Design a protein around this nucleic acid. Structure first.
Ligand SMILES: [Zn+2]
Ligand SMILES: [Zn+2]
Ligand SMILES: [Zn+2]
Ligand SMILES: [Zn+2]
Ligand SMILES: [Zn+2]
Length: 1830
DNA sequence: GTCAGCGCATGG
DNA sequence: CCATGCGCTGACA
């Protein structure tokens, strides 16, 4: 009875979903376990772990300790000796959740005497252990090196018990052998997780081994501790709106929107999908997702569509086949709870034989909760492994990393059972300490000193105000006002969650159901825009918590009252009650209500606000509906009650309700009424009327007996009148079916309006199924509610039909209706509310005065709250007589949940919100307790990072012993519960202080602190855009150059100001914040350490300007005679020279720039190439007034070698080619060396730049610097520091911290969690293992990062200026010439587009293929993209001109409709080529088959494929494609059977099994070829029909008449026509949107084309030939011709193209015009001569490339099509490059730019999308728009 | 280097 | 004869 118990839910067992309760039951079953605590004598059981992952043995042991203490009143202490883990994220997960004394890195070296920890400590191994658990990497065989290390340890120290857990199919017999070699008896069993309390079906193998019949006893006892599951998996899941689930959903949306979709090959599994759909008589419809080839999918409203857009076609079609498989059984997924693990094949897919189970959730899993509509989040995957997730602590781990932890863990119930049995069996082999008294003395003194220490942390309470006392307040405005605000603040779309709002809500006309616009298309209600005004849910949260009492109490209820209610309901005409049900019901209700003090728990925004009040034996909930809000009372069944007991069934639904007086100002005022438990059954008459519709199964596509099943549109219900008197609400009437309004089996009906029932809410009739029941259990229902309900919540119901009744075509039947639970009212029942004070700091900063230095050991008080509790039913949380900590890292979430009724009433505590604290601290201080110094990194050699073992040991130790910044304490003294909260400020201050780097600026560090109240999370957020202030409205100053340029002067002024720094002792103030937050209250306390720094520099970045160099040399020649510093450092030589560092090709242009403006104003010592520093000399190099350098000099290895010689390092040292972190650390040590050397010590032969201090350093580009010389330029030292640039790197925080580092400012520090993942990986490529661990151990919040970005933005406002091309100082305007492609021309674009859709191709593949025929066929299939790759690139050219190939000079179309003939001929030839390929392969297969048959006796792929293909009556796709295929196969000689005689082709290239495998693969190829053929014939039909209709003759009438529907312009409609793009058929637009809404074509028999609504193309859209003229050229080119002919003659033009294939076509096009042009290309160097030829009227309308100066001579610019790029950054770069080419400067005339675009084409699309994204992501600014006239 | 298509085994 | 296994290799960035 034990193997059949885990089949389905055991009803005779109680339900049990709490882990601790599971372990209580377990420890109960085995009482022999006390004997173990008896064997040990106060000794602590010593436990070791190896690769457990989630440390589940530790949780199991802890819970067993609690259970055994509660059960027997004894103490069994355990001691986690050490652990082992090798993945850094798993290590950090351990270290946060469990804090083990030792955490080793690799197990291989456990045999040794010393081993490394996850920090790097190098501690020695512990030694003797009383039990060892391992798994998931310790059986490494299937080399297995880790198993050997574990065995070495087990041999060295002999542990009495060893337990292993791993996958079922592993070499277990080898393990038993090896243990036998090491003198260990062993045994192993397979244990199912669903067999220890948990509804997860997962089978594993455990092994027990002990030093040498014990394993056999262990096996038997473990198998005896088996208890099946009794709760469905849904008791372990979280709610779908819970903050963590919703955070996952928002991350999906954010990742998708932040950012293509190339098709994967899955033909071999597509064959299995097809055979499944065909074998089980499913349809070829995709009901759950409407997924499509070369496109997107769109699911139902509630289904996490951003997850479905991220999976492949195999997974999505598995979801389809699974929903179709359940629908064949009568079950509608989406309304029944089940999980699917679709990660595997379709044939080996048993999602769960019983719905309550969850299949094995494997490490690589694609899980799917049917109800939720989305995946199983990592936390839920953990909670199904027996891990209590209420206080899990996770930081920044991917869903696949969490899935890995969860998949490889071991279930706590199974490990608990195995360890219980081990300890009970081997209980004697564990030694005993047998010295208990001493141990007891020690442990008692330990708890005593701890209790003292906790009693003294919080120091203060003197400035506490202790001013107020407050509870039971009801700030009451008006009940109708509250209902109105509620209705507008609630949830309108599923994607909103608890706190979000969405734009464009729609509301259905009947069954008003709200959804946004992005969601809400798959189920298509009759929608309309919503007339609601969105109000924030936080605002309403405030007002709604104001109205409510924080505790309530029900009184006036006693036996005689219930007796009166019963006797009155029986006096009235209602249900009689069975005596026993009444007994149980009354007893339970009274024992629940008595002494009930309901306390407030939480609100929930869920399309209807709800307040939850919880007591010890009942829950009380205030549902706040639109109409008729009420309180609902629910009585809890005893926990020790079976699943199928009667009592549990009686107490399922609320037994008392309280409907509020809407006019009443009171929130708890109306009368109460009770739900007597009376079961009544009555007869009824259902009748179907009206037109009849296709049923649910038929509309899904199923093709068994479910094909063409019909259901009525309206049912009419007629009751006996006396039953309408008995019942409270009248049910008779007619209910019209609403098929487009989604529900269980599309069964929603709606009562038609009647008399005298107008004021009442609307009543619906639909099928409401249970979450885990069976199909025969379900039944239609009468209710006024229709929303989706959570788990454990029930919907109010008027009545319930039979389970038999399902919609059908039967005329009328008589069924039994179940009315039950009559609502009767008693006036006695009453609801009522219920010196509690609280203290806050009086004034902020009086605290900060009250603190000292060295106060880290104490926590200044922030709050204290006294409240009258009561002795009986007061929880264990309040320690009696003495304070008790909370230990919030493990119990904060569950503690603050029970303190909600107290906290929610508290005022915000916002007095202390501004930075206020002491200042002027010592530069050199490390608390060494709040901030221990991280160890130093050593380098081995190929370069490996090291850790100082002593430093790492001290760092780890001190890091463990840090004070937590928040403290929560509770105590209970004489039935008054007081609790206080403390904030250790000085800790935060010392941490923020320690992070800041040491410097010498003679500026002092100040300190600050503040506490921010009521904060919320900021998780899914778009990146910031950093905007740069320009050099404008700043004074101009005059200056020996020949000219002065005006706007160049305004920037010279700003440079001078930044240089001189009048007054201004400080320019910046480096900030560094260290945060702490208490989440449950919403408090974020942060301490700041800041000091100011004075830096006399600037950053200028002008994309386009008249000049960048003239202003710099102007600055130099200006400041030529001034003493720059007052302080000079004695180590470094000083020079008056100014140094410039330029990428190198411009080092020639710079001195010729300075030559013209200032002639011999001073000396120049320009150098180029490394061998220029050798010829110079410091005195000659001195007395210069400028220096020019080449950034490449820092690449010359001789430079580094000379620097070494001068620094006196080891000669080989400081040598590396890569120049990374190793090189930078090394060069910094050498920098200290070189300064210390040059301290001592006349002219010298070879100088090096780093040895002397400059006056002024300038960097010419700063972004060419290739990271080997970036170090060299950062270490260079001087008095002033400037940057020059064309474009500044300002994309993120790191880019700007680089500018700051060059400046000399510690703008921030990196945490390695701020950037994107791509930058994060490159950072990681050099991180030590200990660093990858420390990155997961600690994280920071989002507000931390936001503040850092704000600091960087301020840095940008202070230092960086971008002078940009000027509006209205250079007049500019943009014109847009959008046109329409004429008929015959647009037809070819349409054909190419849909042909590339059908043949699922988007890009040419650069990778070559090993098989030769494979690459041959691949090229034959790629021929379609003739011009180039990237189908979009081909479409753009087809917008530009009509031609099949632009690189072939054979066929040229002298006009349109001739290119159409070219294209028809080409596609016909390609079709023939594909048929011939098909025939060749079929012959090859006939050969294989005959060759097997000749040697084999003789399921079979090829025979079945031939049989099925030879039948014209069965085919997916066209019937014409099947005609063609059958003609080939008849020509191949098949007469429905294979033929022994072949076609004489080479037979069997070619032991039998292998060639059979070859024949199978050939069959797969054949299927692929038939599919491609179908695509081809469909596309050809579409194009021929388009051309035919477009011609517009009687030929057009021939086809437009021949429609599939039967509506034709011929009888007498003049209505409308439309054709499909997927096929070529045409019926009638109205009679087509209907079939397209059902994923079907109009002719469901002939074509199976997978229609979507995007495939419909109106006939009128196509056009009519002979309308426009495109004689011989493309429309784009002709309009370009008109455009150039339009503008004046004197103006010079400029054209930009993207594709070179179009250069010839445009040149020819314009030569057809009278315009003379100039093309730069064709010459590698005379291109510059062309720009000289452009500068005599020799040229106009010069053409050039999009991606290749100052072509200012022309003002116009013309853009043909939009630039097509993969990234937005590159797009904006190239667009501004081109526009700046004409918009530089020196412009006399106003600039015009023209952009020709093709309407309803891809270029329209790229233009629209890029324009939209430029506004958000960039803060790029638009050009004016004016309509151009010439 | 990484990930999804692809596959019958295996114990009772 | 059923219920349940949980990775690997080869194509690709
Ligand atoms: Zn939505
Ligand atoms: Zn609707
Ligand atoms: Zn400190
Ligand atoms: Zn029609
Ligand atoms: Zn069709």
């Amino acid at each position: 009875d034990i193997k059949a118990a885990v089949r389905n839910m055991s009803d005779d067992l109680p339900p049990i979903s709490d882990i601790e309760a599971m372990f209580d039951h377990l420890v109960s079953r085995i009482p022999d376990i006390v004997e173990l605590v008896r064997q040990l004598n106060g000794r602590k059981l010593r436990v070791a772990t190896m690769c457990s992952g989630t440390e589940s043995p530790l949780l199991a042991l802890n819970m067993i300790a609690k259970a055994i203490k509660a059960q027997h009143g004894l103490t069994l202490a355990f001691e986690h000796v050490f652990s082992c883990e090798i993945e850094p994220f798993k290590q950090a997960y351990i270290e946060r959740n469990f804090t083990p004394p030792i955490l080793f890195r690799d197990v291989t070296e456990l045999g040794k005497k010393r081993a490394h920890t996850a920090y790097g400590s190098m501690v020695d191994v512990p030694g003797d252990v009383d039990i060892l658990i391992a798994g998931t990497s310790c059986v490494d065989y299937s080399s297995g090196r880790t198993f050997r290390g574990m065995l070495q340890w087990v041999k060295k120290h002999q542990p009495p018990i060893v337990i292993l857990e791993n996958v079922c199919n592993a070499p277990w017999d080898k393990v038993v052998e090896y243990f036998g070699q090491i003198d260990y008896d062993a045994q192993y069993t397979r244990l199912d997780t669903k067999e220890f309390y948990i509804p997860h079906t997962r089978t594993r193998v455990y092994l027990f081994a002990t030093p040498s019949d014990l394993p056999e006893k262990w096996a038997q006892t473990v198998k005896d501790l088996r208890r099946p599951w009794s709760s469905p998996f849904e008791a372990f899941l979280l709610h779908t709106d819970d903050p963590n689930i919703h955070r996952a959903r928002l991350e999906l949306a954010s990742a998708r929107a932040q950012t293509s979709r190339k098709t994967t090959d899955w033909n071999r599994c597509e064959s299995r999908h097809q055979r499944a759909r065909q074998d089980e008589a499913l349809g070829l419809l995709r009901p759950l997702t409407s997924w499509q080839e070369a496109g997107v999918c769109k699911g139902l409203d509630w289904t996490w569509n951003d997850w479905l857009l991220a999976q492949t076609e195999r997974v999505v079609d598995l979801l389809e086949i699974s929903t179709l498989r359940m629908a064949k059984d009568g079950i509608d997924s989406g309304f029944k709870a089940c999980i699917w693990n679709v990660s595997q094949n379709v044939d080996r897919q048993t999602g769960s034989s019983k719905t309550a189970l969850a299949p094995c959730l494997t490490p690589n899993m694609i899980p799917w909760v049917t109800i939720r509509g989305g995946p199983v989040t990592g936390r839920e995957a953990l909670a199904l492994q027996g891990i209590p997730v209420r206080e899990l602590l996770l930081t920044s781990e991917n869903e696949d990393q969490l899935a890995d932890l969860a998949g490889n863990a071991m279930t706590t119930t199974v490990v608990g059972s195995a360890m219980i049995a081990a300890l009970k069996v081997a209980c004697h082999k564990i030694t005993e300490g047998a010295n208990p008294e001493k141990e007891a003395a020690l442990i008692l003194e330990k708890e005593a000193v701890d209790d003292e220490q906790v009693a003294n942390r919080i120091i203060g309470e003197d400035y506490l105000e202790h001013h107020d006392l407050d509870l039971a307040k009801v700030t009451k405005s008006n009940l109708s006002e509250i209902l109105d605000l509620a209705c507008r603040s609630s949830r309108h779309c599923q994607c909103e969650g608890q706190s979000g709002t969405a734009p464009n809500i729609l509301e259905c006309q009947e069954c008003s159901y709200r959804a946004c616009k992005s969601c809400g298309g798959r189920p298509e209600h009759v929608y309309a825009p919503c007339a609601n005004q969105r109000v924030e849910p936080a605002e309403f949260e405030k007002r709604f918590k104001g109205l409510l009492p924080m505790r309530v109490r029900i009184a006036g209820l006693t036996d005689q009252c219930l007796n009166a209610v019963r006797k009155a309901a029986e006096k009235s005409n209602k249900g009689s009650v069975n005596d026993n049900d009444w007994q149980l019901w009354s007893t339970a209700l009274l024992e629940g209500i008595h002494d009930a003090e309901f306390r407030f728990r939480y609100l929930k925004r869920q399309s209807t606000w709800t307040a939850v009040y919880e007591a010890r034996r009942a829950m009380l909930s205030l549902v706040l509906r639109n109409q008729i809000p009420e309180w609902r009372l629910t009585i809890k069944a005893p926990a020790s009650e079976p699943n199928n007991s009667q009592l549990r069934a009686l107490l399922l639904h609320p037994v008392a309700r309280l409907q509020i007086d809407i006019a009443g100002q009171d929130v708890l005022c109306g009368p109460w009424e009770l739900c007597i438990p009376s079961m009544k059954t009555i007869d009824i008459e259902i009748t179907g009327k009206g037109e009849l519709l296709p049923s649910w199964q038929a509309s899904l596509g199923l093709q068994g007996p479910f094909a063409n099943t019909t259901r009525w549109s309206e049912v009419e219900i007629s009751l006996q009148a006396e039953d309408e008197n008995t019942l409270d609400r009248k049910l008779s009437g007619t209910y019209q079916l609403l098929p487009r309004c989604g529900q269980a089996m599309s069964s929603l009906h709606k009562k038609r309006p009647d008399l005298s029932d107008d004021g009442l809410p609307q009543l619906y009739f639909f099928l409401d199924p249970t979450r885990c029941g069976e199909s025969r259990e379900d039944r239609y229902v009468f209710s006024t509610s229709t929303e989706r309900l959570d788990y454990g919540t029930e919907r109010p119901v008027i009545a319930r039909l039979d389970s038999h009744w399902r919609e059908g075509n039967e005329k009328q039947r008589k069924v039994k209706l179940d009315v039950s639970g009559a609502w009767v009212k008693c006036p006695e029942a009453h609801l009522t509310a219920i010196r509690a004070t609280f203290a806050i700091p009086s004034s902020a900063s009086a605290i900060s005065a009250s603190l000292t230095t060295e106060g880290c050991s104490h926590a200044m008080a922030l709050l204290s709250c006294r409240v009258p509790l009561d002795p009986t039913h007061s929880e264990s949380m309040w320690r009696r007589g003495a304070w008790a900590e909370i230990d919030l890292s493990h119990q904060g979430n569950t503690t603050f949940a029970n303190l909600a009724w107290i906290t929610e009433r508290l005022p915000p505590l916002d007095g202390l919100k501004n930075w206020a604290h002491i200042a002027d601290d010592v530069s050199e201080h490390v608390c060494e307790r709040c901030a221990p110094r991280p160890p130093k990194i050593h380098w081995i050699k190929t370069i490996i990072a090291f850790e100082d073992k002593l430093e790492a040991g001290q760092y780890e130790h001190a890091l463990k012993h840090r004070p937590s910044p928040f403290v929560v304490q509770l105590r209970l003294d004489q039935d008054i519960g007081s609790f206080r909260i403390g904030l250790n400020i000085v800790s935060l201050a010392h941490r923020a202080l320690s992070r800041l780097p040491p410097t010498t600026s003679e500026h002092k560090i100040s300190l600050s602190w503040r506490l921010t109240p009521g904060h919320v999370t900021e998780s899914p957020q778009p990146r910031r855009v950093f905007i740069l202030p320009s050099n404008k409205q700043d004074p101009e100053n005059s200056q020996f150059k020949l000219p002065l340029r005006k706007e160049q002067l305004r920037s010279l002024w700003w440079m001078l100001e930044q240089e001189k720094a009048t007054g201004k002792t400080h320019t910046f103030v480096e900030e560094e914040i260290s945060e702490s937050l208490l989440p449950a209250v919403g408090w974020r306390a942060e301490g700041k350490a800041e000091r100011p720094v004075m830096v006399r520099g600037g950053v200028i970045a002008d994309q386009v300007g008249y000049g960048k160099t003239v202003i710099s040399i102007a600055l130099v020649a200006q400041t030529l005679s001034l003493p720059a510093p007052e302080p000079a450092t004695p180590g470094l030589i000083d020079l008056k020279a100014t140094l410039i560092v330029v990428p190198g090709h411009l080092s020639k242009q710079w001195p010729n720039e300075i030559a013209r403006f200032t002639g011999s104003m001073f000396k120049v010592i320009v150098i180029q190439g490394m061998k220029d520093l050798q010829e110079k000399t410091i005195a000659e190099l001195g007395k210069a007034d400028i220096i020019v350098m080449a950034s490449e000099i820092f690449e010359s290895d001789v430079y580094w070698s000379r620097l070494e010689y001068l620094s006196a390092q080891p000669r080989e040292w400081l040598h590396d080619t890569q120049g990374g972190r190793f090189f930078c650390d090394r060069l910094d040590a050498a920098m200290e060396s070189l300064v210390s050397q040059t301290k001592i010590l006349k002219l010298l032969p070879n100088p090096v730049l780093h040895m002397f201090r400059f006056r002024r350093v300038i960097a010419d580009e700063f972004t060419y610097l290739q990271k080997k010389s970036l170090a060299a330029v950062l270490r260079l030292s001087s008095s002033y520091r400037w940057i020059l640039s064309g474009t500044p790197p300002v994309s993120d925080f790191a880019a700007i911290r680089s500018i700051a580092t060059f400046m000399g400012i510690h703008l921030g520090v990196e945490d390695d969690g701020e950037g994107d993942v791509q930058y994060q990986k490159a950072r990681a490529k050099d991180q030590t293992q200990a660093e990858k661990f420390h990155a997961f151990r600690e994280v920071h919040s989002r507000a931390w990062h936001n503040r850092r970005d704000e600091l960087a933005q301020e840095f940008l406002n202070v230092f960086v200026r971008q002078n940009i091309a000027e509006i209205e100082d250079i007049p500019t305007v943009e014109h847009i010439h959008t046109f329409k492609l004429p008929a015959s021309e647009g037809a070819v674009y349409l054909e190419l587009e849909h042909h590339l859709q059908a043949l699922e191709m988007q890009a040419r593949k650069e990778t070559k293929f090993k098989n030769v025929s494979q690459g041959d066929r691949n090229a034959r299939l790629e021929e379609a993209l003739s011009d180039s790759k990237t189908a979009e690139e081909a479409l753009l050219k087809r917008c530009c001109h009509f031609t099949l190939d632009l690189s072939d000079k054979t066929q040229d179309a002298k006009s349109a409709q001739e290119a159409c003939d070219h294209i028809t001929s080409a596609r016909a030839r390609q079709l023939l080529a594909c048929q011939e390929d098909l025939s060749r392969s079929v012959n090859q297969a006939i050969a294989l088959h005959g060759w097997i048959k000749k040697k084999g006796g003789f399921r079979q792929p090829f025979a079945e494929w031939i049989a099925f293909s030879s039948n014209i009556s069965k085919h997916q796709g066209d019937i014409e494609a099947a005609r063609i295929l059958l003609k080939v196969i008849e020509k191949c000689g098949v007469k429905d059977g294979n033929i022994p005689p072949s076609p004489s082709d080479k037979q069997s290239p070619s032991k039998m099994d292998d060639v059979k495998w070859q024949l199978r693969e050939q069959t797969h190829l054949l299927r692929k070829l038939v599919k491609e053929l179908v695509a081809r014939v469909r596309s050809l039909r579409f194009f021929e029909v388009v051309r035919k209709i477009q011609k517009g003759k009687s030929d057009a009438q021939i086809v437009l008449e021949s429609s599939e529907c039967g509506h034709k312009p011929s009888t007498n409609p003049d209505i409308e026509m439309a054709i499909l793009s997927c096929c070529g058929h045409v019926a009638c637009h109205k009679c087509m949107r209907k079939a397209a809404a059902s994923q079907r074509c109009v002719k469901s028999g002939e074509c199976q084309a997978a229609v979507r609504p995007t495939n419909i193309v109106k006939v009128s859209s196509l056009g009519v030939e002979g309308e426009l003229s495109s004689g011989r050229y493309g429309a784009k080119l002709e309009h370009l011709v008109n455009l150039i002919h339009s503008i004046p003659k004197n103006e010079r033009v400029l054209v930009f193209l993207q594709w070179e294939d179009l250069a010839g076509k445009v040149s020819e096009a314009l030569s057809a015009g009278r315009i003379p042009h100039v093309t730069l290309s064709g010459s590698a160097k005379s291109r510059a001569n062309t720009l000289d030829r452009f500068q005599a009227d020799s040229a106009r309308v010069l053409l050039l490339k999009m991606n290749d100066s100052n072509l200012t001579t022309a003002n116009h610019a013309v853009f043909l099509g939009p630039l097509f790029t993969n990234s937005l950054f590159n797009y904006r770069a190239v667009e501004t490059q081109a526009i700046g080419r004409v918009r530089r400067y020196g412009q006399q005339k106003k600039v015009h730019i023209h952009r020709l675009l093709a309407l309803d084409t891809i270029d329209m699309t790229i233009f629209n999308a890029r324009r939209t994204e430029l506004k958000e992501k960039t803060d790029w600014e638009e050009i004016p728009q004016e309509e151009y006239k010439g």
